[PDB]
Amino acid sequence: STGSATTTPIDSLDDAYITPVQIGTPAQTLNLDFDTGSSDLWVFSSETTASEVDGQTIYTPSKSTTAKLLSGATWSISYGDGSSSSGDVYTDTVSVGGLTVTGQAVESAKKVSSSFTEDSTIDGLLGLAFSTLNTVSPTQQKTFFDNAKASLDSPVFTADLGYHAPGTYNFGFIDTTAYTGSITYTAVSTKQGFWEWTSTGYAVGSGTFKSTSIDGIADTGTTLLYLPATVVSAYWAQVSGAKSSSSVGGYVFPCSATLPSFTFGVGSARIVIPGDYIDFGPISTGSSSCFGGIQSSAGIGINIFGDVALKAAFVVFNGATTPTLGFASK
Numbered sequence: 036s037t038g039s040a041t042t043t044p045i046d047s048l049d050d051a052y053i054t055p056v057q058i059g060t061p062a063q064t065l066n067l068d069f070d071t072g073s074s075d076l077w078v079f080s081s082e083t084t085a086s087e088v089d090g091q092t093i094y095t096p097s098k099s100t101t102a103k104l105l106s107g108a109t110w111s112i113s114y115g116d117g118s119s120s121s122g123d124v125y126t127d128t129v130s131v132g133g134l135t136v137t138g139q140a141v142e143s144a145k146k147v148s149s150s151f152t153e154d155s156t157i158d159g160l161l162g163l164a165f166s167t168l169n170t171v172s173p174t175q176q177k178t179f180f181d182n183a184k185a186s187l188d189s190p191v192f193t194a195d196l197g198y199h200a201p202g203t204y205n206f207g208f209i210d211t212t213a214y215t216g217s218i219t220y221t222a223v224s225t226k227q228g229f230w231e232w233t234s235t236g237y238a239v240g241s242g243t244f245k246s247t248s249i250d251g252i253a254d255t256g257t258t259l260l261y262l263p264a265t266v267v268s269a270y271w272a273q274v275s276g277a278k279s280s281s282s283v284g285g286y287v288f289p290c291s292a293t294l295p296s297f298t299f300g301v302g303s304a305r306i307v308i309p310g311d312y313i314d315f316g317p318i319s320t321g322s323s324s325c326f327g328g329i330q331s332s333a334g335i336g337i338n339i340f341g342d343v344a345l346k347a348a349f350v351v352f353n354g355a356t357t358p359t360l361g362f363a364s365k
């Protein structure tokens with residue numbers, strides 16, 4: 036089997052991408068944030084504290100003929116920005132782009148933190164990291180991809196995110212029309228539960244390539260590109276007036292600037308992020324200070340190849356017995 040679904044930016048900045056997901060019988064379609072950096076499928080629901088729901092579409096398990104309470108199971112998760120959610124668990128039929136998993140754990144939120152309430156466009160998350168990170172207790176649950184894998188034509192999914200435009204998540208096949216050149220595959224460590232890999236270095240703009248190993252994770256659920264402070268300083272030093280602002284929380288730059296590209300290494304191959312992809316616009320409405328798309332990982336303890344990086348590439352998440360990651364230009 037295969038599936039294919041379109042993913043769409045939630046706003047003009049590509050702050051996140053949402054993908055429609057069918058849950059239950061008859062189908063209830065919710066727009067979920069596919070997150071290769073976590074492993075829980077959780078939804079706003081008829082159980083979510085009413086004061087914490089503000090425009091989201093909710094899953095109502097009592098209206099699904101295929102929903103079953105996973106008795107005694109609870110879940111609780113936090114994310115890298117400090118946001119969090121928790122609740123109980125149902126199993127139900129879940130379909131993404133024509134690919135169906137029966138008995139998928141659907142984690143129903145009883146509580147969500149303020150940032151989730153405030154994002155009316157995100158109805159929940161669909162985790163695509165390794166199932167060892169799933170938070171369901173006392174019986175840990177598998178991700179949608181892990182449950183689907185044995186049925187797929189090939190044990191893979193691909194992320195083809197757009198720049199200020201929709202893109203595609205495919206399951207079970209590689210669309211050879213969606214990229215240019217070849218896909219370069221690189222080894223993955225699952226030791227932390229992430230799609231963790233080692234970039235071979237970087238370049239700023241038209242500068243020469245710096246060969247250096249950068250461990251990090253491929254994370255579709257993180258907006259920006261977080262790299263070591265040395266690398267990030269070398270990038271922003273090329274932008275007149277760019278500076279790290281503790282009050283804003285990262286590097287800002289004059290909105291009048293044209294940004295240089297940023298290249299990262301995948302083995303002997305290179306992915307080039309155009310400068311425009313690094314522009315996240317005014318820090319507040321009307322400001323002439325703009326927020327940078329490349330930020331330091333120093334405070335978070337892990338380098339994150341988030342959407343800024345991934346949207347410059349066609350990315351293969353290969354969940355074969357020995358997992359790997361593939362990157363192609365597009």
Ligand SMILES: C#CCN(C)Cc1nc([C@]2(O)CN[C@@H](c3nc(-c4ccc(C(F)(F)F)cc4)no3)C2)cs1
Pocket residue numbers: 051068070071072073113114115116118149150151152154157160254255256257334335336337
């Ligand atoms: C700090 C630190 C050390 N480590 C935890 C950093 C890491 N952090 C992650 C992620 O938690 C998994 N992938 C990212 C992700 N964030 C979201 C998200 C968050 C908030 C909302 C909102 F604003 F709606 F509430 C929406 C989506 N979705 O995915 C972050 C992996 S490693």
